[PDB]
C-alpha cells in the first residue's frame, strides 16, 4: 500500500499530480550523502566528490530521505514524493559521517550545472560565508540551476550559507499547525517554507523513516520546482523561484517565513 506523508498532502502535491504534473523530463540533483538504490526510487546517475567514497551509494541515510521527498515513485509501495517522475541524479558531497570540504560541494554545484540539472537540492549549512562556495552557486545559477538550500536548524533568527546568497532559494520548515518549527533558521534572505517536522521518507535498507530539519523541508521546494518546470518548460531558474514564492501561502511575518508555504497546486497552474 502506498501511504502520502502529511508534508505531501500539505504542498498540495496531489492535486498537482492529478492535472498531470509529475516533474517528468526536469532533472534534479540531490546534494547530499548520496542516494541509496531504493524499491521507491529511481536513480538516473550522479557522481561521488567524496574521496574515500566513489560509489553515490549512502552510508547516512540523508540524501536518500532527501530524494523520497522529491521523487518517491507513484505506485502501490512505500510513500510518494512531491514530482514522482523527476531525473534524479545522486550528487554524494558529503561523505557517511555527514561531513566534507566546501570544496567537494563546489564540485558538485559544477558538475549540476555541466549536467544540464534543472535543479539542484543542497542540504547542507554553514553559519560562515565561502567564497569557493558562493562562487559555485553563482555558477550553477549562471548555467541555469535552481540551486534550493535549507535555512539551518539552529533556530537562530538569520539563515545559514549558503542558503543566504542571493542566487540560492532559502527554504524554512513549518510544523503540522504551520508554524515555524523551533529549530528552523529565519530572517534575512529567507525566500520560503515548507513541512520539516515527522518528514516521513525513503531510507537505506529499503525501509522509511521519520525525520526533522529544515533539510527535510527542501525538497518539497526542489518538488514544486520540478513541477513548475514540466508546466513552463521555457521558463528559466529565476522566473520559477519568483512564481513559487508568487503563489505561496502567506503565514504571516515574512522575517519568519518569507513569501509564506509552498503550495504546489497554485504554483502548476
Ligand atoms: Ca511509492
Ligand atoms: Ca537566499
Known amino acids: 500500500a502506498q501511504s502520502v506523508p502529511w508534508g505531501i498532502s500539505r504542498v498540495q502535491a496531489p492535486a498537482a499530480h492529478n492535472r498531470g504534473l509529475t516533474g517528468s523530463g526536469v532533472r534534479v540533483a540531490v546534494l547530499d550523502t548520496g542516494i541509496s538504490t531504493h524499491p521507491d526510487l529511481n536513480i538516473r546517475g550522479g557522481a561521488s566528490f567524496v574521496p574515500g567514497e566513489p560509489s553515490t551509494q549512502?552510508?547516512?541515510?540523508?540524501?536518500?530521505?532527501?530524494?523520497?521527498?522529491?521523487?518517491?515513485?507513484?505506485?502501490?509501495?512505500?510513500?510518494?514524493?512531491?514530482?514522482?517522475?523527476?531525473?534524479?541524479?545522486?550528487?554524494k558531497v558529503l561523505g557517511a559521517s555527514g561531513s566534507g570540504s566546501y570544496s567537494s560541494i563546489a564540485q558538485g554545484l559544477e558538475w549540476a550545472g555541466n549536467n544540464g540539472m534543472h535543479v539542484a537540492?543542497?542540504?547542507?549549512?554553514?553559519?560562515?560565508?565561502?567564497?569557493?562556495?558562493?562562487?559555485?552557486?553563482?555558477?550553477?545559477?549562471?548555467?541555469?540551476?535552481?540551486?534550493?538550500?535549507?535555512?539551518?536548524?539552529?533556530?537562530?533568527?538569520?539563515?545559514?550559507?549558503?542558503?543566504?546568497?542571493?542566487?540560492?532559494?532559502?527554504?524554512?520548515?513549518?510544523?503540522?499547525?504551520?508554524?515555524?518549527?523551533?529549530?528552523?533558521?529565519?530572517?534575512?534572505?529567507?525566500?520560503?517554507?515548507?513541512?520539516?517536522?515527522?518528514?516521513?521518507?525513503?531510507?537505506?535498507?529499503?525501509?522509511?523513516?521519520?525525520?526533522?530539519?529544515?533539510?527535510?523541508?527542501?525538497?518539497?521546494?526542489?518538488?514544486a520546482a520540478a513541477l513548475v518546470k514540466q508546466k513552463n518548460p521555457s521558463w528559466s531558474n529565476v522566473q520559477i523561484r519568483n512564481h513559487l514564492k508568487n503563489t505561496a501561502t502567506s503565514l504571516g511575518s515574512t522575517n519568519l517565513y518569507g513569501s509564506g508555504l509552498v503550495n504546489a497546486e497554485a504554483a502548476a497552474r
Not at 547516512?60 to 502501490?76: E, M, P, R, Y
Open 58 to 91: 549512502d552510508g547516512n541515510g540523508h540524501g536518500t530521505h532527501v530524494a523520497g521527498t522529491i521523487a518517491a515513485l507513484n505506485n502501490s509501495i512505500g510513500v510518494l514524493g512531491v514530482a514522482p517522475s523527476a531525473e534524479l541524479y545522486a550528487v
Open 121 to 223: 537540492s543542497l542540504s547542507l549549512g554553514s553559519p560562515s560565508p565561502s567564497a569557493t562556495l558562493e562562487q559555485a552557486v553563482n555558477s550553477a545559477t549562471s548555467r541555469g540551476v535552481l540551486v534550493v538550500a535549507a535555512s539551518g536548524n539552529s533556530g537562530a533568527g538569520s539563515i545559514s550559507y549558503p542558503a543566504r546568497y542571493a542566487n540560492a532559494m532559502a527554504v524554512g520548515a513549518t510544523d503540522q499547525n504551520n508554524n515555524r518549527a523551533s529549530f528552523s533558521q529565519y530572517g534575512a534572505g529567507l525566500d520560503i517554507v515548507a513541512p520539516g517536522v515527522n518528514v516521513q521518507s525513503t531510507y537505506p535498507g529499503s525501509t522509511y523513516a521519520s525525520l526533522n530539519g529544515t533539510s527535510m523541508a527542501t525538497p518539497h521546494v526542489a518538488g
